[PDB]
Structure formats: C-alpha cells, structure tokens
Amino acid sequence: DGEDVQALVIDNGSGMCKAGFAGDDAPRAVFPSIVGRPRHTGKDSYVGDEAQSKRGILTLKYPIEHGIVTNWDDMEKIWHHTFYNELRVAPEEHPVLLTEAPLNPKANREKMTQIMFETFNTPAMYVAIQAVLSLYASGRTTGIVMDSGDGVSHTVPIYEGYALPHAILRLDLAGRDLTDYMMKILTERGYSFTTTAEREIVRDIKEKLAYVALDFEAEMKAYKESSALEKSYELPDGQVITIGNERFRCPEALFQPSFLGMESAGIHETTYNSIMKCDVDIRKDLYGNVVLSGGTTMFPGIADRMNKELTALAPSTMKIKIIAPPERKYSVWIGGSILASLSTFQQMWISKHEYDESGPSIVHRKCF
C-alpha cells in the first residue's frame, strides 16, 4: 500500500502479531506469533497458521512471553514473515513503527533497533509503548489503560501524553490462562478438553460464549436454579456440547485470580493500585479515563464490572468512566497508524543516519 513514503506499523504480541500500513484504519495482517522449526531436519522455519498446521513435525515456539521478546532469532523470523509473506514489501523502503510492552528491558529496546537497521535495513524506525498508543487511539492524552492480551496484563497511568513508569503494574494473568482455565472447568463439567486441538476449540468457546457477570454470586445462583442461560456449541465434528456457568466463571478469573491458584490482585484492584501510586492531583483524571484495551478485554460485561469494582474502591463522589472501544483488539495498532501518519511525525523517527552515528543506544533518547 503507499502517500509519499509509506510507513508501516507492527504491533507484536505474545499471541498475535498485528501488522499494516500507517494511514489504514486496521491492521492488514493478523497472525499467530509462533515460529516452527523441524523436530529433526529441514535452517528451515514456519510462521503462524502454517506452523500450527504442521505442528506434528515441528517444535513450535513463541518468541514473545508476557509481552517481552525472549528469542531474537525467532523474533527475526516473525518480522521477515511480516514483511515478505504478509505485507509483501521491501523493508528497506519503509519507515517502520514497532510497539513494545511497558517497562520493556533496556537491552531489548536496543536489540529491536539494531535488528531493524542491520538485518532489515529500514531507512527509519520508531518504538512506541502499546498502552500509550491505545490511549492516543481513544482520543486522550491523560488516563489509565488496562491492557490485557494473550500473555500479560498491564495497568498504565498516562499524563499529558507519557506513561508514569513508577505507577505501572504488571499482571501475568491473561488470555492464555483463561483458555487454559476454561479447558479445566469444562473438563470438570464432564467433557474432555486437554489436547492442543482441543485448546484451540476452547479458545473459540471462550471468545464466542464467555462474558463477565456483573454480580458473580447472583449469577451462580441464577444458573443453579434455571437453565435459560446455558448455551450450545457445535464442535468441529458436529457433536454439540452445552456450556453453563463456565461462561462467566472463566473470565471471573480476571477479578479473582485465586480461581487459577494465583495470589495476586485482580484487574480492578491492580487498576486501583496503579492510580494510588500517582500524584493525588491527577487521580481524578485517571478514574475519569479508564481505557480498556486488548483481546482479553473483549468479554461482554467487562466495562460494567470494572465500573462497579472501581466505584466500590474509590470515594463515592469520584466520577468513574470506563471506555471500551469496540475496536479495542486493535487499539494499539490503530494508535500507531495515526501517530505514524501525522505531518509532524517526520522528525520523530530514528533515521539510519542517527543509527549510524550513535548505534542502538539512540533508542533511549529518541523513543521516550
């Protein structure tokens, strides 16, 4: 795709990679962040769906874990796939914006920069914090983003355009933990969901039929007494199963991590705790601008429940507002697309010239 120079935007997640062209309203390519290599022989590698489909002869890996890159060689393959198989561009002809997790380690930031300029020869690149790009995408410069994807959740207070690093909180509770938990409770129901193929079916049940109850205990109660809210689901073979209270018990784990045997605070309390680490004078603007982002915030009912839980935690006169854009699976990517399209972004990129002068450590001064 391509105005004058056409910038690209890549949003790398633990579970999914989202890639596209600056200026579009959605990512053109959305694929699993998975790299497959031969269990025995042919060097060779597969990415995404194609890796998944030949999984029986490959060793599959995830180069990003809890939002952080842990394998650079496989991260390069995601990228090579992104440029050549998905977007079909020559990376040397485009500025590339990339996203990272809040608090990404300093050396990781360098490495990303180094790979772009030295392996792909990008003419220019930029690194942006995922959570800040969603805030921007919702048309705000101050607020708190609760970003939850497949491998990590974060609460990130932002003020006048920048994250407040001391108040950011991380929670290793996300989508994958939820799919796993639905596998386990559906299995207790009397079904059997333990394999890989089954995990994928379960991920699909979770995304189609799960929801967050507004009142957990009243719901458990309504289901104990009536059948009216149960749903059918057809498996790939035509067998039909019935889903009862698993529908809301699975995402309840976001609010009650004990359900997964975790001792941490739920997303509502993590949000509260981040707000309380900020200066008292901005808190009002945090509570008033709670932005939800990422695939694991897509459960129906989640905004209302977050509204209720924060209301119960904060002083009764505090004005709370939960914003949950319908496109929030792609908010990060969309924010990046907007940012990189601006007539004023030109000077913000790291250019090849700047890289050749300072090296990878240019990233700590330019991508703030």
Added chain:
Amino acid sequence: MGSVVEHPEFLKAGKEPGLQIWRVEKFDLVPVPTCLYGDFFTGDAYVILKTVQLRNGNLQYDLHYWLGNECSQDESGAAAIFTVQLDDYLNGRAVQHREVQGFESATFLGYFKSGLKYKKGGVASGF
C-alpha cells in the same frame, strides 16, 4: 539526534497573547480562518491554544483539543497527539485539556466572546 517539529504552525504557536485555532484535516494541523473562530464542525476535531501574558514577561499556555460528536477516530487521535506535540514544543509549559462537544469546561466556552456555535458536517477522514 533531536526530535523537533519543523511544521510551520508550530513556529507560529503561542508567540503572543491571544487565541489560535487549528482544525485536524487528514492527519495535518491546519489553521482556521480567524473570521471563523467559534464555529465548530461537529464532524471534526480541533486544537486550541490560549496564550495569556504573565506579569513575569513569559507566557501562559492552555491547550484544548475539541472533539465533535461525529469526528472520526483519526481526527480525535490526531488532535490529542498534536496537543502533546505542541506542549513538548513549548517546553512542557501548556496545560492540556480534553474538550468534548456538549461538555466543554467554562474556561473554554469563555474564550468565545460571541458564543461558540456548533454546525453539522466537516472534512472527510484521513484514513
């Protein structure tokens, strides 16, 4: 090595006491003709800088990004980012304000001596 906006409108921003208004138009910051100040297209987003003279000789800045009820996501996202950029350009000195149609602060409404007006329509989205 640095990251400084060279846009011609940043060079004019906040040079002297007064009111400056820009509309977001397909990912750019475009001045509004001064004879049109106070009339806002509800299908658009705008950036407003109010510059006031301080006794000290320096200037006070309030930056307001106004969002019409039908503006597209690229417009409200650009208005916000431009606001951050203008604040940075001005050494962090501006106080930022998010103004939503139908809910603007009294200070913002007080800038339009003959009363802010809304009109339907606007410029098409940049996406």
